[PDB]
XYZ file of C-alpha atoms in Angstrom:
566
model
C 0.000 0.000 0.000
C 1.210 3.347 -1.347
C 3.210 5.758 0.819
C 0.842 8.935 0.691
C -2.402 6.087 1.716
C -0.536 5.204 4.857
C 0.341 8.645 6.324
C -3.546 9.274 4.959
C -4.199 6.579 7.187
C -2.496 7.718 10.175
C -3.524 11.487 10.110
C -7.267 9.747 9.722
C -6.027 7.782 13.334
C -4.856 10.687 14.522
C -8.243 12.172 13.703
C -10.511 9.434 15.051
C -9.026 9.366 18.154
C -9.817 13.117 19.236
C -13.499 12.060 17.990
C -13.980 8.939 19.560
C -12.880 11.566 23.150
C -15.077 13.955 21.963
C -17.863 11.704 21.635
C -17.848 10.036 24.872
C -19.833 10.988 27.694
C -20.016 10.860 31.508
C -23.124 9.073 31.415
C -21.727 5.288 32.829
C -24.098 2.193 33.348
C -23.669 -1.205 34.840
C -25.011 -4.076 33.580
C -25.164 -7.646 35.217
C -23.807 -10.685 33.499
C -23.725 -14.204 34.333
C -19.799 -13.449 34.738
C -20.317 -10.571 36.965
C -21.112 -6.611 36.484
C -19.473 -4.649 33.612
C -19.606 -0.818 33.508
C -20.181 0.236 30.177
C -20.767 3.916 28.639
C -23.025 6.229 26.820
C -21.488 7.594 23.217
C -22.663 9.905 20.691
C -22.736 9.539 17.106
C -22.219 12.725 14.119
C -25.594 12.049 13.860
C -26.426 13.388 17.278
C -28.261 9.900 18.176
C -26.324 8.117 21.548
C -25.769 4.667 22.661
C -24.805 2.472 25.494
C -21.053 0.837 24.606
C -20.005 -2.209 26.062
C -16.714 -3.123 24.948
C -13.610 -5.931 25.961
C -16.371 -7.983 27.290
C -14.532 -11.424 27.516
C -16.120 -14.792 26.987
C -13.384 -16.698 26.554
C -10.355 -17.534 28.968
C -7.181 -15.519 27.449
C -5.781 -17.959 24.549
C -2.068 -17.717 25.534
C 0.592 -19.911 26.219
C -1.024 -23.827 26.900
C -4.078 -22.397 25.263
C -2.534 -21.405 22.183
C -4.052 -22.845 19.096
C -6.441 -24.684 21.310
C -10.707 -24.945 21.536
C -11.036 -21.811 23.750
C -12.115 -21.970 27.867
C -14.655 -20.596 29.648
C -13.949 -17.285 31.072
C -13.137 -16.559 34.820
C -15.957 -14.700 37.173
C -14.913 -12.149 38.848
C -16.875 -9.810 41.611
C -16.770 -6.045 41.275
C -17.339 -4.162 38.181
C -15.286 -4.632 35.270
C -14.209 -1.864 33.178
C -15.820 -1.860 29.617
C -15.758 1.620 28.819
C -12.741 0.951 26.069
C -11.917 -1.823 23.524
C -9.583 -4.766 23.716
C -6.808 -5.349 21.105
C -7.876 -7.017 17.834
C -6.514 -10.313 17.109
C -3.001 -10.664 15.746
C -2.684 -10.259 12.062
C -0.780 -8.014 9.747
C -1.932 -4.741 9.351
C -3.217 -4.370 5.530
C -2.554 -0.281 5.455
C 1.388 -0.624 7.262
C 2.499 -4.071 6.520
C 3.351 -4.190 10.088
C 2.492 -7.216 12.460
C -0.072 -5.727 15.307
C -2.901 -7.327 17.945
C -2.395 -9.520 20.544
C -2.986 -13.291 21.441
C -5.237 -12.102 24.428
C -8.420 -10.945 21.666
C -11.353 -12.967 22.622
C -13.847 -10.454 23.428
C -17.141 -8.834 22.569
C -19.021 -5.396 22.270
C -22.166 -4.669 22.873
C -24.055 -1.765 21.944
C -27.919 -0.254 22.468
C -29.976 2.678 22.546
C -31.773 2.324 25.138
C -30.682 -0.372 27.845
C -34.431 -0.104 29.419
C -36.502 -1.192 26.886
C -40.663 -1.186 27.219
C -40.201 -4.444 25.260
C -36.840 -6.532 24.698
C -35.401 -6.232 21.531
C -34.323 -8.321 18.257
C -30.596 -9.397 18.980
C -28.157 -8.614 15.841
C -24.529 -10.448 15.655
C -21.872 -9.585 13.414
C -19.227 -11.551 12.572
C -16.249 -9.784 10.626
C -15.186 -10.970 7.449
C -10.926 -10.526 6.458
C -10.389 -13.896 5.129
C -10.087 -15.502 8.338
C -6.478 -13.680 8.922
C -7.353 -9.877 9.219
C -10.761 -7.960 10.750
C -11.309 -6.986 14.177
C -14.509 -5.419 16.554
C -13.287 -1.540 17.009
C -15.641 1.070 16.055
C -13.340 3.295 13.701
C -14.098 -0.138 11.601
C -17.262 -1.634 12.503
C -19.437 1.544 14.348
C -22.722 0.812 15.498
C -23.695 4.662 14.977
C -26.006 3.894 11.688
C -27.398 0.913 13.730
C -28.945 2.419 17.413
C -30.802 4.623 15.341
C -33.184 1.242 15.750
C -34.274 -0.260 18.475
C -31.916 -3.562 18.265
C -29.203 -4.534 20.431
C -25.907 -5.063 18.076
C -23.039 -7.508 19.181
C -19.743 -8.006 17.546
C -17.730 -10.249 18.133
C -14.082 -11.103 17.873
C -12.311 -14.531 17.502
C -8.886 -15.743 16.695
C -7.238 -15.762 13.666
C -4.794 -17.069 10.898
C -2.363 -19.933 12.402
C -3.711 -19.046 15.751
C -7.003 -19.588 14.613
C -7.093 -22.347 12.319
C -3.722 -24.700 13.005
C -4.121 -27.960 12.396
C -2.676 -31.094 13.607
C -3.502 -34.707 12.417
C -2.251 -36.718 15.817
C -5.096 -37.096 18.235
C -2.935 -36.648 21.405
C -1.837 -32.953 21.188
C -5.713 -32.070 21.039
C -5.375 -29.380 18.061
C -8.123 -30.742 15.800
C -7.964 -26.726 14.303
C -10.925 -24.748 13.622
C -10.290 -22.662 16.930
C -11.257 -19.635 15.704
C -14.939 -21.019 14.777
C -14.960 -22.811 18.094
C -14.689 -18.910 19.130
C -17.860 -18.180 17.673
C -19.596 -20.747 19.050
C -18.605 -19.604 22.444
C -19.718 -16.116 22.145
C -23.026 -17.225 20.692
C -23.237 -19.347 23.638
C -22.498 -15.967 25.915
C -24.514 -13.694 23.267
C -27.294 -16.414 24.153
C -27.192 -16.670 28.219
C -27.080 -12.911 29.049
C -28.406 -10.764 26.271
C -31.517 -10.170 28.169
C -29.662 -8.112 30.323
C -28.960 -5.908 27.608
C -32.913 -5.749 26.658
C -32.516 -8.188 23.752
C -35.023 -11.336 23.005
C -32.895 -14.259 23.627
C -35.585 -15.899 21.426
C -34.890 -13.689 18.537
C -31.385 -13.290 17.701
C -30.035 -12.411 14.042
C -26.313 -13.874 13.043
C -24.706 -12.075 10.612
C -21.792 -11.917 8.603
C -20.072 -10.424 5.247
C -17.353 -12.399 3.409
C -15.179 -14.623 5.669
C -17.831 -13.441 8.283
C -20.413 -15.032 5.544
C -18.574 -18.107 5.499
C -18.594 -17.936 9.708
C -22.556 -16.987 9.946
C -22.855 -20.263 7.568
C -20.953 -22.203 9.439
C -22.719 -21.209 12.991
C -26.102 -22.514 11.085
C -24.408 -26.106 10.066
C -22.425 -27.201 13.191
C -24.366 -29.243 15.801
C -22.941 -27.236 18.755
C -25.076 -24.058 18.014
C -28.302 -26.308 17.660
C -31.798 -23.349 18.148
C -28.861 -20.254 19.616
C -30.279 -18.034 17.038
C -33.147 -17.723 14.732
C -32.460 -15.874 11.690
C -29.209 -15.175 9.503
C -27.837 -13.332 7.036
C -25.012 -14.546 4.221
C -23.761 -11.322 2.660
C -21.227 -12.452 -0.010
C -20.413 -16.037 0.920
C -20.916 -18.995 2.701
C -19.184 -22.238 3.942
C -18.573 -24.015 0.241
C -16.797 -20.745 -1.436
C -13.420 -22.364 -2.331
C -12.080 -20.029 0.173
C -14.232 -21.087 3.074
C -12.515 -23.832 3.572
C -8.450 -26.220 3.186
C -7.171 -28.798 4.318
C -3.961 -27.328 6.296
C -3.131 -30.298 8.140
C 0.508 -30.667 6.607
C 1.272 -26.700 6.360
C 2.095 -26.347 10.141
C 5.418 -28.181 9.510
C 6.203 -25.312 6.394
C 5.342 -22.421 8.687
C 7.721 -24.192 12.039
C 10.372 -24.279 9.199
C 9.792 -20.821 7.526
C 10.430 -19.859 11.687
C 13.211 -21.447 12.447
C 12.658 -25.117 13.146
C 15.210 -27.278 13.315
C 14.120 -31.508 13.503
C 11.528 -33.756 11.584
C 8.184 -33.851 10.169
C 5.990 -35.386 13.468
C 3.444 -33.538 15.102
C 4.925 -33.360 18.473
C 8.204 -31.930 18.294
C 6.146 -29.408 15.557
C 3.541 -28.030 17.936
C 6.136 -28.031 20.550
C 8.080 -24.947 18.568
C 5.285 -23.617 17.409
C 3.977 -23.301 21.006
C 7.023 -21.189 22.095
C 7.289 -19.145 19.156
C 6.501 -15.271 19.121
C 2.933 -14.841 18.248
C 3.893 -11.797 15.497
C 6.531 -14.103 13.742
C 4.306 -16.903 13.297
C 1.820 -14.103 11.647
C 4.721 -12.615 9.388
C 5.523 -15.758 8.236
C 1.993 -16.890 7.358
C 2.330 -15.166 3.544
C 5.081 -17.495 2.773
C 3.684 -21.033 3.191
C 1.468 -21.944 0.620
C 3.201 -23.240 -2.796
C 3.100 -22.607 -5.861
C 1.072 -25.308 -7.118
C -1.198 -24.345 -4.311
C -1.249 -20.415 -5.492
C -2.210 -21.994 -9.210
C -4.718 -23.568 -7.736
C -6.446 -21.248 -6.426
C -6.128 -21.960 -2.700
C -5.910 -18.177 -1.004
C -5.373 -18.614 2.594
C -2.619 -21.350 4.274
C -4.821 -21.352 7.473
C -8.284 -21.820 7.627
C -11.310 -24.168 8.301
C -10.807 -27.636 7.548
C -12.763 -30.575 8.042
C -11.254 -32.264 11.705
C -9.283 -35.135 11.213
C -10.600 -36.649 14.379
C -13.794 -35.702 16.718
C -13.316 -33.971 19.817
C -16.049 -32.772 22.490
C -15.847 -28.589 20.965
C -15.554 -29.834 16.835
C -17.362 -27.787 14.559
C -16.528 -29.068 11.138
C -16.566 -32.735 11.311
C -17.595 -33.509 7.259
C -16.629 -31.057 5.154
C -19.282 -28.344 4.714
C -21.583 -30.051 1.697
C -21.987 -32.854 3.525
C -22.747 -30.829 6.802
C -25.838 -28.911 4.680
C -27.799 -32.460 4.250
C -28.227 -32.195 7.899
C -27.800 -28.722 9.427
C -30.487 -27.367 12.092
C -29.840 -24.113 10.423
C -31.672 -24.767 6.946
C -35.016 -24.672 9.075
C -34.424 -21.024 10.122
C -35.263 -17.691 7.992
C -32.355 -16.816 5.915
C -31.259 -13.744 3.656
C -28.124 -14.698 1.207
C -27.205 -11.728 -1.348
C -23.540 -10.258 -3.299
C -23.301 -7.147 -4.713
C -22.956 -6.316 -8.564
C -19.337 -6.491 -9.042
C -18.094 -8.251 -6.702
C -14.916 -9.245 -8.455
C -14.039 -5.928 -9.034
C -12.166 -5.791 -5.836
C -9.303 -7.671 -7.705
C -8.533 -4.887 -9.751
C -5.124 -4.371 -7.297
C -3.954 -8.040 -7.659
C -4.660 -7.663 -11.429
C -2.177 -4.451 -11.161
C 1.163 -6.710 -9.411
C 0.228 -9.723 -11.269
C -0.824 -9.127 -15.086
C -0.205 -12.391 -16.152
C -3.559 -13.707 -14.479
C -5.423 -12.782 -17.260
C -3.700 -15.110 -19.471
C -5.189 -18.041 -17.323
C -8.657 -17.569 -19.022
C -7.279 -18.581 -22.489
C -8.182 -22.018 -20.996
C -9.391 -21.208 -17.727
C -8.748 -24.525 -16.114
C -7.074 -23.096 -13.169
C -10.872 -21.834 -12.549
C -12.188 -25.107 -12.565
C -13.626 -26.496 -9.299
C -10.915 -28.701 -7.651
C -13.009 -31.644 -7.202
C -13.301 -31.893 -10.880
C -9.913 -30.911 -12.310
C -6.611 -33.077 -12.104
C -3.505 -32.455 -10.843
C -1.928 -30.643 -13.576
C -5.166 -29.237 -15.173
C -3.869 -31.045 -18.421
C -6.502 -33.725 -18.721
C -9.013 -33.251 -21.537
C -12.145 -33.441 -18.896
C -10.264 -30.599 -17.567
C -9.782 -28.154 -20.658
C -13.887 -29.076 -21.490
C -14.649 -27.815 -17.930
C -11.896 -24.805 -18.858
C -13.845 -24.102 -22.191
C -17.613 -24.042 -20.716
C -16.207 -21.322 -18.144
C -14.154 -19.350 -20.937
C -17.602 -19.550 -23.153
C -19.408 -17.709 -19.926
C -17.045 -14.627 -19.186
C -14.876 -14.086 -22.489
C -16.460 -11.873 -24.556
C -14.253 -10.605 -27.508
C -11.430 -13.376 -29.078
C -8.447 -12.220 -26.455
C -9.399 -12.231 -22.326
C -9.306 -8.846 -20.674
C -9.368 -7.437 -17.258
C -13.272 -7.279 -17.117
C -13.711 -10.988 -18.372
C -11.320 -12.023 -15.168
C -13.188 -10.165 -12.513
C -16.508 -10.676 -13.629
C -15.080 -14.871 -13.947
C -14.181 -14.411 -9.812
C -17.317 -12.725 -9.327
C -18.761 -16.272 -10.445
C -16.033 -18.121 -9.021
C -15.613 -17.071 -5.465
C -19.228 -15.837 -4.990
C -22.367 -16.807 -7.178
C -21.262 -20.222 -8.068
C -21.008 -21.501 -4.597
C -24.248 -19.591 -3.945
C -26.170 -21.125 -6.389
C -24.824 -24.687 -4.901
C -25.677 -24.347 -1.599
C -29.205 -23.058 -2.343
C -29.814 -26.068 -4.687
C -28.589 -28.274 -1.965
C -29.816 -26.510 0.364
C -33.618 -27.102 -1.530
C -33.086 -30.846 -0.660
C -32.912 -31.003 3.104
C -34.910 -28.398 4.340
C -38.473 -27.633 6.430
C -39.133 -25.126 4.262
C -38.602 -21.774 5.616
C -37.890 -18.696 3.381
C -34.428 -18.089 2.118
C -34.948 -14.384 0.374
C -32.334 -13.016 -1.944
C -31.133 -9.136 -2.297
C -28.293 -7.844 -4.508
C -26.662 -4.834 -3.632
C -25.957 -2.249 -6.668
C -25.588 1.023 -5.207
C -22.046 2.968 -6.355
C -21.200 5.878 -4.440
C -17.570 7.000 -4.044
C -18.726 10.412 -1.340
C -18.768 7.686 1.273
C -16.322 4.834 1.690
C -14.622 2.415 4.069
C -10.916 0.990 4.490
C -11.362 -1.687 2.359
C -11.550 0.671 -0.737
C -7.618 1.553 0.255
C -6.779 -2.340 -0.008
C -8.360 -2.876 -3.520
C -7.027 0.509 -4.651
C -10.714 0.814 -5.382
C -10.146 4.922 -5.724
C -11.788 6.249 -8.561
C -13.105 3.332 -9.876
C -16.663 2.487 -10.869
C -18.741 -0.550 -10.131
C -20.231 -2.165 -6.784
C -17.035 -4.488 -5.595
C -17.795 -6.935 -2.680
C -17.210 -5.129 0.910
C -18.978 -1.573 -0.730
C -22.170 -2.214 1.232
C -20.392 -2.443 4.230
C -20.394 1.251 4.069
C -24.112 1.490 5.005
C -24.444 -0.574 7.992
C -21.476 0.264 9.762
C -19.599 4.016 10.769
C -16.044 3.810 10.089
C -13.381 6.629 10.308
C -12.995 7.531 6.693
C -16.903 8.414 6.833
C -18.700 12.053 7.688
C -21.987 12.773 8.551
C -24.275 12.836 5.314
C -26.828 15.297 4.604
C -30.468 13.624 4.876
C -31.502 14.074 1.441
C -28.685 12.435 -0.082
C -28.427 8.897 -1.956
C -26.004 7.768 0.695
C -27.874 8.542 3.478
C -31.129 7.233 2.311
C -29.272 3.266 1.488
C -28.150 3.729 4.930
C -31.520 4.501 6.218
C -32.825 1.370 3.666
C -30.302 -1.160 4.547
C -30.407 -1.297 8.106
C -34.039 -0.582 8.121
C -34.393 -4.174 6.000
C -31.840 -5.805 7.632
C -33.569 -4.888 11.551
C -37.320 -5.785 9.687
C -35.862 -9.158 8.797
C -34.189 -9.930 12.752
C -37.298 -8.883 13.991
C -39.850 -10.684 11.898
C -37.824 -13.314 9.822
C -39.523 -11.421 6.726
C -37.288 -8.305 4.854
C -40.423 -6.557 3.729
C -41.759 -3.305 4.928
C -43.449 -0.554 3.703
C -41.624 2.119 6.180
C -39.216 1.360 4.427
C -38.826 4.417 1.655
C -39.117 2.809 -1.740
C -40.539 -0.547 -0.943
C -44.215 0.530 -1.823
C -43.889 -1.574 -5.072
C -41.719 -4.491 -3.971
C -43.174 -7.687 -3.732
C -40.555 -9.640 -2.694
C -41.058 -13.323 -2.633
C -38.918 -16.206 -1.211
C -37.076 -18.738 -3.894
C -38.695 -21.580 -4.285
C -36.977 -25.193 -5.527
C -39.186 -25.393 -8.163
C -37.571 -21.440 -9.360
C -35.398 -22.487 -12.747
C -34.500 -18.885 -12.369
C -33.589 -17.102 -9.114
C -35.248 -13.630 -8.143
C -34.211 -10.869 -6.234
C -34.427 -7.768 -4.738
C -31.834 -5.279 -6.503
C -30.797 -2.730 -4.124
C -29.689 1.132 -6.134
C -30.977 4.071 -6.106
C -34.550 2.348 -6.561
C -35.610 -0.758 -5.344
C -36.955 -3.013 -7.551
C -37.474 -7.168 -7.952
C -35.428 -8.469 -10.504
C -34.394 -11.703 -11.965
C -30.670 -12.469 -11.065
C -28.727 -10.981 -14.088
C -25.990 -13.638 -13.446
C -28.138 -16.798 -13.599
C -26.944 -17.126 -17.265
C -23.861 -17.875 -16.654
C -24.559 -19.490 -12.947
C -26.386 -21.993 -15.094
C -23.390 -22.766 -17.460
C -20.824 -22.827 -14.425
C -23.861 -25.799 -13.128
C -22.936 -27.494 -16.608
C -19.256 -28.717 -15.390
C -21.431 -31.319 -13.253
C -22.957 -32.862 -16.234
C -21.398 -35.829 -15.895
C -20.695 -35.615 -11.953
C -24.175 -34.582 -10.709
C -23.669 -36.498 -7.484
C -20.776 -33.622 -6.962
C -22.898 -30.950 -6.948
């Protein structure tokens, strides 16, 4: 990231640390938990609305030392009043802006924020889970501010959980207890504390609303398919992904001996003497070192992250992911509760900065095999099944007779996002009560408001809806201002959290107090559907069929012959 973004960046630090002051009050509360009291504090917004803040609320045991890279602990009670009047440290991760290493192991906490901690009547529960690819993100407020939000009457939770290495190791012997998936067995936990003692916050513990955008999609998914969340929460919301992106999930079983070695790891290839350095190593050099361990053939293929979820290679008493996540849909609890799945217009527009570094990806789609799903393609991506699978995906996103820049980003928009979408819902259609899964898709482009993840994608000056542009409306961040009330920006605020707090509170998206809506109709899909409708979110609202089922349809076509893959 360029020199002028990052002193940008810190001046805008500088800057949203005199506001976050300036916007604190006097006013402090306590609130009981089933942990003990926690004294939280009233805020104010540019808005001039104000909220409760609870923030560092632990509900996990500290993951450090023994703990590391283990299923997390229930936290200790204490008795007095614990300070939650300012956030925790995010988990440890490199920094996407400076390149630097920053965080700390000790990150398992949660914030909690609400109008009005006296409600007449309690309130729908919202819970956001953080996307950043399962190795960046965090739950601070000059990222993910509830400002937009207490202008409802909800209480909003978000949550933080362990990442990268620390998150998602993975060992295959059965006697050093690291099955991986730690950082979901996080979110399980906090759901677990989100569940028990939201009612002293004013929120329905019988209406609570999971959440999630990218890796946080993939999470929210995966807190609806495990066992151990069985009836915690009642509705949920996939914004740009789910657990069966290629992304969501690796098997990283073999890659903890790579990083040890990229560390400084001297011995063999067991388990043991493995998890024994990589117990005592500093947490910020095992996070440095994280960039380095995939392979080549592994980059070719697609595979994005070295740590990650993975399917357990034995069961333990906490495991989340004990099939890998297809199998886990035939019987999740979760496919019998309200859902709303949606991706913006462009969502693999965000590439455009990887495009920049590496130009030579857009020679891949003269074949496009490396695009193929992995399950079907071979080793090399040389067999002729393989370049057949390569030419019905070239067919759908090459338009003229060389690839451009366009054809490759709109190709990941299919690949990382719509694709597995279309997948789950099919498969979803199989083994389910019955209950409404609505779709939106977000197409409103506005460059007067942003949010940090513009700076990664170099997404300045550039038109289109990339994936992580709606986070804009739902959540403050410090590159944002107060918007006048007339304008486009601040009326998609105004819509989007409206629809997403009508959908926690009912299970249904639809309302007409909702400005725009009077001639929406918007229906649930149903299995029967050959095409897939939608409500398309710009600067009107309006029902649509999904302009991408096209080429969803000729993406279904590499199954042909290998139906029972699909």
């Amino acid at each position: 990231v360029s020199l002028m973004e990052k002193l940008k960046w810190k001046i805008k630090c500088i800057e949203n640390k005199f506001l976050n002051y300036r916007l604190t009050t006097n006013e402090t509360v306590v609130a009981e938990t089933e942990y003990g009291k926690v004294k939280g504090v009233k805020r104010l917004t540019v808005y001039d609305d104000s909220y409760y803040s609870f923030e560092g609320i632990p509900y996990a045991q500290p993951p450090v030392g023994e703990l590391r890279f283990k299923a997390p602990q229930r936290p200790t009670p204490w008795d007095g009043v614990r300070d939650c009047c300012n956030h925790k440290d995010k988990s440890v991760q490199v920094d996407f802006i400076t390149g630097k290493v920053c965080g700390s192991e000790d990150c398992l906490y949660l914030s909690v924020y609400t109008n009005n901690l006296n409600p007449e009547t309690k309130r729908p529960v919202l819970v956001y889970i953080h996307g950043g690819g399962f190795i960046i993100g965090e739950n601070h407020r000059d990222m993910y501010g509830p400002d937009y939000f207490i202008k409802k009457d909800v209480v909003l939770i978000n949550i933080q959980y362990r990442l990268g290495a620390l998150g998602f190791l993975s060992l295959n012997s059965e006697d050093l207890n690291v099955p991986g998936n730690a950082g979901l067995k996080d979110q399980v936990m906090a759901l677990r504390w989100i569940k028990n003692n939201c009612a002293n916050f004013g929120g329905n513990p019988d209406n609570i609303t999971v959440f999630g955008e990218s890796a946080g999609a993939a999470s929210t998914h995966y807190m609806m398919l495990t066992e151990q969340t069985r009836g915690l929460f009642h509705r949920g919301i996939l914004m740009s992904g789910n657990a069966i992106c290629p992304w969501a999930n690796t098997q990283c079983q073999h890659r903890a001996f790579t990083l040890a070695k990229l560390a400084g790891y001297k011995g063999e290839d067991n388990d043991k003497d493995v998890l024994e350095f990589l117990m005592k190593a500093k947490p910020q050099d095992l996070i440095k070192l994280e960039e380095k361990v995939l392979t080549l053939e592994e980059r070719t293929n697609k595979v994005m992250f070295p740590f990650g979820p993975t399917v357990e290679p034995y069961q333990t008493a906490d495991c989340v992911l004990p099939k890998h996540p297809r199998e886990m849909v035939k019987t999740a609890w979760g496919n019998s509760i309200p859902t709303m799945m949606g991706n913006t217009s462009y969502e693999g527009l965000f590439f455009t900065s990887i495009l920049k570094q590496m130009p030579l990806l857009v020679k891949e789609l003269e074949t496009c095999v490396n695009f193929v799903p992995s399950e079907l393609a071979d080793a090399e991506r040389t067999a002729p099944e393989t370049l057949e699978m390569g030419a019905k995906i070239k067919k759908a996103h090459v338009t003229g007779e060389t690839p451009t820049a366009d054809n490759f980003m709109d190709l990941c928009s299919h690949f990382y996002f719509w694709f597995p979408m279309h997948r789950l819902l099919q498969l979803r259609f199989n083994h389910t009560s019955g209950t409404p899964v609505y779709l939106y898709r977000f197409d409103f482009d506005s460059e007067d408001l942003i949010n940090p993840y513009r700076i990664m994608r170099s997404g300045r000056g550039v038109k289109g809806v990339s994936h992580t542009d709606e986070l804009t409306y739902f959540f403050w961040n410090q590159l944002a201002k107060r918007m006048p009330k007339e304008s486009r920006e601040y009326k998609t605020i105004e819509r989007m959290t409206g629809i997403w707090t009508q959908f926690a509170t009912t299970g249904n998206p639809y309302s007409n107090e909702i400005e725009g809506m009077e001639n929406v109709s918007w229906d649930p899909i149903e299995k029967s559907d050959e095409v897939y409708k939608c409500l398309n979110i710009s600067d009107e609202l309006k029902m649509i069929d999904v302009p991408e089922m096209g080429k969803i349809k000729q993406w279904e076509s590499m199954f042909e012959k290998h139906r029972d893959l699909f």
